[PDB]
Every structure is written in structure tokens, then in C-alpha cells.
Amino acid sequence: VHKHTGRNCGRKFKIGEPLYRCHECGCDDTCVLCIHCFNPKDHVNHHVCTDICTEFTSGICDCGDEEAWNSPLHCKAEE
Ligand SMILES: [Zn+2]
Ligand SMILES: [Zn+2]
Ligand SMILES: [Zn+2]
């Protein structure tokens, strides 16, 4: 299971996978969540950008990295 309780997710995105950012919750535009981590309950009427990862964009999910978020998140995988 995708739980990573007590540490950062750090799941590496693959090309074609969904990535989630939130204007309000993210510290900057590079702060992102994977589909296993993103919880809609954290982001009601927030300005959520869901993109499809490309060859150009590449990186890791920031869930559990509190240095990347303005609000406490609640991992979807933890539910
Ligand atoms: Zn994740
Ligand atoms: Zn997570
Ligand atoms: Zn949000």
C-alpha cells in the first residue's frame, strides 16, 4: 500500500501519471502530490491544478514534506 506514515512520500512520477498542485496549500509551483496522496477533502474550493506528467516535467511527491505546504495535509493513502 502507498502509506508512508511518519515520513515523506517521495514517490517518483512516471510520464503520463497525474500530478496535483494547490495554489493555496503549496509553498510554490513545484510543490506537488501524487494521486495516492492527494485528498480532495483537504482542498474543497481550493484552486487545484491537476496535470499529466510529461518527459519534460519530472519529480517526486511532496506529501509528508511539511516544508512544501502551508496547511497540514491528510494523506489519502492513510484513509
Ligand atoms: Zn505521494
Ligand atoms: Zn501521502
Ligand atoms: Zn489545497
Side-chain angles (χ1 to χ4, degrees):
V1 209
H2 324 285
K3 280 111 159 174
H4 60 88
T5 180
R7 50 156 278 193
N8 68 303
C9 176
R11 175 176 268 272
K12 187 87 136 59
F13 295 99
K14 289 145 57 76
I15 299 163
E17 295 188 327
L19 63 97
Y20 294 79
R21 289 178 298 210
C22 183
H23 179 78
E24 292 71 35
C25 309
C27 284
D28 63 50
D29 274 319
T30 70
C31 303
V32 187
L33 295 163
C34 71
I35 197 163
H36 307 122
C37 289
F38 178 87
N39 197 332
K41 281 154 66 186
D42 290 327
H43 315 282
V44 182
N45 287 142
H46 282 194
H47 292 82
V48 180
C49 176
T50 137
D51 273 322
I52 290 296
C53 192
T54 62
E55 176 213 44
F56 306 97
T57 56
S58 67
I60 59 158
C61 166
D62 299 298
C63 191
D65 183 350
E66 288 297 336
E67 209 171 58
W69 309 104
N70 294 313
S71 295
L73 294 179
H74 306 88
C75 211
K76 192 190 187 282
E78 211 64 59
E79 284 175 353

